[PDB]
Design a binder for this molecule. Structure first.
Ligand SMILES: Cc1ccnc2c1NC(=O)c1cccnc1N2C1CC1
Lengths: 513, 399
């Protein structure tokens, strides 16, 4: 039949010795009919009360919590799953369901002892039937793995005699596609159900098998196109904090295919909310957004599948301050997948840093769906990039990319002078300043942190100065912040400074102990 | 087979496998499929819960892929089992990859499960091939030790028939030193190659010689300049101050004095006599590594790098802050490529000098690093590493 996977209990641990709950003569009756049907099929077998282990049964459910707590760990039933975009179209695709899947496979002979349970007697000093499993008990720790594992082992053969047939194994289901004519396709599928039958693995026949599209893990899978199972936007007039959370949630999921989905305004609605059932009224911008999404959703878009023969193009756009959108395709607008990126790494950044980070995310994502990186189309020119890169303290790398003139283009809104500016006033800051020209202002700040006091000073200087300044400061903090040439900030003060900076012609910042 | 065990109470590794590019994957498939046929490795079942990350790297001016197994975690949990201070003085050293030697020695059957590794599939469309080693694996700290004996033997002839040569082995590498002429060297090297074939072969680093005899410390430097502006001086004092924490003999008193008043940055300042002499001394003080720093073998060897620019980097190897065992420079491509090349370079030096690898501090983002390093990596070992945010002031204070 199939090999047997050697199991073991965790070290220094004995099998489960737990008392069977008192049953019912009505429930005892059913268990015995079930356990007898089963022993005639070999799945189980009466044991000699030589066995001191026991696992609770009820009505047929067997509670293996305890055994599981004592059973060795197995290799992950792998939680990584395919993304529809990484698929190559097939003409026909058949979903093969598996019944008794688990019961179909044996169990390490030396382990069965541990799977013991007892069917109580009806009369006091009469029986009290004892058994053990010879197969894979559902609810058991190792079943899913041994199964998958074993399953895998079986298809391998068939798989090599049919390199045209593609098979994905997912829990008790089994997706099988091919580029064969419906007929030869339907043929192999039986060739398969057979191969699986030689190991007594029941799969339903074509009459009952499920038909396409295939609604898998929130997707709608055909053999030539893909989408996420369509979504309905509520038309409520009263919105609960929870309602919004759920909506936002759903909205996201869309983004991997539906281009243009925004949630900034809906998200804003959560600020300060005090209970999952609190009702928040919609804002003008919020409903505008909701409607725009609703609209975008009305029209169903479907994603195309992967054609390894062709290149992968990734194209990125700035959709807002801090928002980026992208799409990856092989043929123009012939999307495989789309997506957004709002991740802000650091309290302050610039589009260059952000765009670059956006590229990494994408890159990573591709090596995973396609095992290769795409050729990028970006709204920034090499000169701008290089400039930044070249002068940033962190090592960075962007693959093959083509500048694409799609506004808004990303640029550096300002650059600090690399050397003091000749004949430009010199401000010395420590909340107040002093210039070489005699000017000064010692201002007042309340509720200000140490770090935030420093930045205030600099702001002053920037304020009162002309289009060219030299600014000396002892704050390594501030220096750092500004030297990173951010253009957006979580902090308001910064943003104000940033505004100054951009206005200037030439600015020089220096540090002193 | 010799019994090997994990350190008391420790279990085997269960590290996730970083996703790989189809290219790298097929290379590994091709490779592993033949390692199986040769019974070096064996497919394993679900009852094995362990795992280690594998990667495919390329051989230099060679057309084959090398399989690299990140046995870092494992090596840390494997039971514990010297070093020629003469090597670092040798004029020439060549590094060889004696990795394939290990494959003739079987691995204790009960340790095997710990070497489990996995070959991923693209987009998780297939479970993923799983294996464990049957023979000593390249990269495992146990393999050299376990092979030590068999090594000394086949090496005792050349060691006495050519004791002008120093030979050091670190993991899969053999560091062969000498003072001969670069032509005599390359020859004696080639011979050892067949002398190893007799008793059975690659060189790492482009069939090239490290010239450790030519490794020096990058002293801290000061701008020598015609006229000195206020800015110039401010930078000067700042640099000095930092540097004063290392060399306490440094005084800035006079320099700081040319700075009284709130003068324009660009205003030139002719320096006084006292100032000039104070600089002279400080300049003299920095002419050499600080006295007192010694290599503690019981401590971690740390290595920080800084990006300077134009393809230039600065590193410093130490055990205790400010107390540098070595400082260097590296100059060229792209940032990453360069970075990796520096790491490998800096590691090789650490091995040669102290026979140990450093713990790097890197100026890059993990995701980016995880993504590209394997592309330019060629070494057979893998240093440890963490990711940091270099301070603009430190980059300033070097090169
Ligand atoms: C859920 C799933 C996971 C992985 N691959 C597939 C599927 N299901 C499909 O419907 C599918 C669609 C298009 C191409 N391959 C597909 N299949 C491949 C097996 C024929």
């Amino acid at each position: 039949p199939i090999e047997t996977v050697p199991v073991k209990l965790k070290p220094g641990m004995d099998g489960p010795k737990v008392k069977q709950w008192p049953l019912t003569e009505e429930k005892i009756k059913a268990l015995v009919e079930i356990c007898t049907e089963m022993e005639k099929e070999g799945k189980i077998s009466k044991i000699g009360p030589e066995n001191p282990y026991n696992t609770p049964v009820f009505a047929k459910l067997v509670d293996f919590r305890e055994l599981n707590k004592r059973t060795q760990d197995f290799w992950e039933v792998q939680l990584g799953i395919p993304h529809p975009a990484g698929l190559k179209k097939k003409k026909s695709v058949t979903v093969l369901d598996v019944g008794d899947a688990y019961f179909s496979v044996p169990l390490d002979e030396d382990f069965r002892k541990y799977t013991a349970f007892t069917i109580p007697s009806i009369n006091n000093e009469t029986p009290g039937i004892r058994y053990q499993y010879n197969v894979l008990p559902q609810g058991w720790k190792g079943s899913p793995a041994i199964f998958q594992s074993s399953m895998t082992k079986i298809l391998e053969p068939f798989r090599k005699q049919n390199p045209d047939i593609v098979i994905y194994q997912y829990m008790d289901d089994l997706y099988v596609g091919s580029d064969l004519e419906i007929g030869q396709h339907r043929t192999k599928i039986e060739e398969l159900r057979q191969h699986l039958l030689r190991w007594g693995l029941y799969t339903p026949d074509k009459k009952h098998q499920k038909e396409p599209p295939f609604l898998w893990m929130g997707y709608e899978l055909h053999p030539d196109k893909w989408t996420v199972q369509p979504i309905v936007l509520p038309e409520k007039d009263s919105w609960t904090v929870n309602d919004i959370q759920k909506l936002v949630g759903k909205l996201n999921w869309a983004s991997q295919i539906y281009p243009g989905i925004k949630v900034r305004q809906l998200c804003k609605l959560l600020r300060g909310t005090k209970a999952l059932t609190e009702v928040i009224p919609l804002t003008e911008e919020a409903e505008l957004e909701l409607a725009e999404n609703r609209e975008i959703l009305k029209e169903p878009v479907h994603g195309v599948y992967y054609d390894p023969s062709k290149d992968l193009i990734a194209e990125i756009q700035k959709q807002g301050q801090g928002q980026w959108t992208y799409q990856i395709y092989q043929e123009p607008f012939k999307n495989l997948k789309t997506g957004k990126y709002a991740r802000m790494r650091g309290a302050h950044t610039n589009d260059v840093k952000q765009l670059t980070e956006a590229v990494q995310k994408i890159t990573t994502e591709s090596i995973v769906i396609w095992g290769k990186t795409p050729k990028f189309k970006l709204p920034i020119q090499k000169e701008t990039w290089e400039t930044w890169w070249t002068e940033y303290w962190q090592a960075t790398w962007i693959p093959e990319w083509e500048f694409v003139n799609t506004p808004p283009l990303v640029k550096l809104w300002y650059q600090l002078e690399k050397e003091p500016i000749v004949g430009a006033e010199t401000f010395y800051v420590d909340a107040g300043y002093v210039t070489n020209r005699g000017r000064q202002k010692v201002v007042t700040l309340t509720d200000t942190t140490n770090q935030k006091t420093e930045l205030q000073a600099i702001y002053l200087a920037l304020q009162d100065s002309g289009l060219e300044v030299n600014i000396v400061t002892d704050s390594q903090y501030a220096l750092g912040i500004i030297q990173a040439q951010p253009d957006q900030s979580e902090s308001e003060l910064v943003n104000q400074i940033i505004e100054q900076l951009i206005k200037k012609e030439k600015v020089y910042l220096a540090w002193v102990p | 087979t010799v019994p090997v065990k994990l350190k008391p109470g420790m279990d085997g590794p269960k590290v996730k496998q970083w996703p790989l590019t189809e290219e790298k994957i097929k290379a590994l498939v091709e490779i592993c499929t033949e390692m199986e046929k040769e019974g070096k490795i064996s497919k394993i079942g679900p009852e094995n819960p362990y795992n280690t990350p594998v990667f495919a790297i390329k051989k230099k001016d060679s057309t084959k892929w090398r399989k690299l197994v990140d046995f870092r975690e494992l090596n840390k949990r494997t039971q514990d089992f010297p070093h020629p201070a003469g090597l670092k003085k040798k004029k020439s050293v060549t590094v060889l990859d004696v990795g394939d030697a290990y494959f003739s020695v079987p691995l204790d059957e009960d340790f095997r499960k710990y070497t489990a590794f996995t070959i991923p599939s693209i987009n998780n469309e297939t479970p993923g091939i799983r294996y464990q080693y049957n023979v000593l694996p390249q990269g495992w700290k146990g393999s050299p030790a376990i092979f030590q004996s068999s090594m000394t033997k086949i090496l005792e002839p050349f060691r006495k028939q050519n004791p002008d040569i120093v030979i050091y082995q670190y993991m899969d590498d053999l560091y062969v030193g000498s003072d001969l002429e670069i032509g005599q060297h390359r020859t004696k090297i080639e011979e050892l190659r067949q002398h190893l074939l007799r008793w059975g072969p690659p060189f790492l680093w482009m069939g090239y010689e490290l010239h450790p005899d030519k490794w020096t410390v990058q002293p801290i430097v000061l701008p020598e300049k015609d006229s000195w502006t206020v800015n110039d001086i401010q930078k000067l004092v700042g640099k000095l101050n930092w540097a004063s924490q290392i060399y306490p003999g440094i005084k800035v008193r006079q320099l700081c004095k040319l700075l009284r008043g709130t003068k324009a940055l660009t205003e030139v300042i002719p320096l006084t006599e006292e100032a000039e002499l104070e600089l002279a001394e400080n300049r003299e003080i920095l002419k050499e590594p600080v006295h007192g720093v010694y290599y503690d073998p019981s401590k971690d060897l740390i290595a920080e790098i800084q990006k300077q620019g134009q393809g230039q980097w600065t590193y410093q190897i130490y055990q205790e802050p400010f107390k540098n065992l070595k400082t260097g420079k590296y100059a060229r491509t792209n940032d990453v490529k360069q970075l990796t090349e520096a790491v490998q370079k800096i590691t090789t030096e650490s091995i040669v000098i102290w026979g140990k690898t450093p713990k790097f501090k890197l100026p890059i983002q993990k995701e980016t690093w995880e993504t590209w390093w394997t592309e330019y990596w060629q070494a057979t070992w893998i240093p440890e590493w963490e990711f940091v945010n270099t301070p603009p002031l430190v980059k300033l204070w070097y090169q």
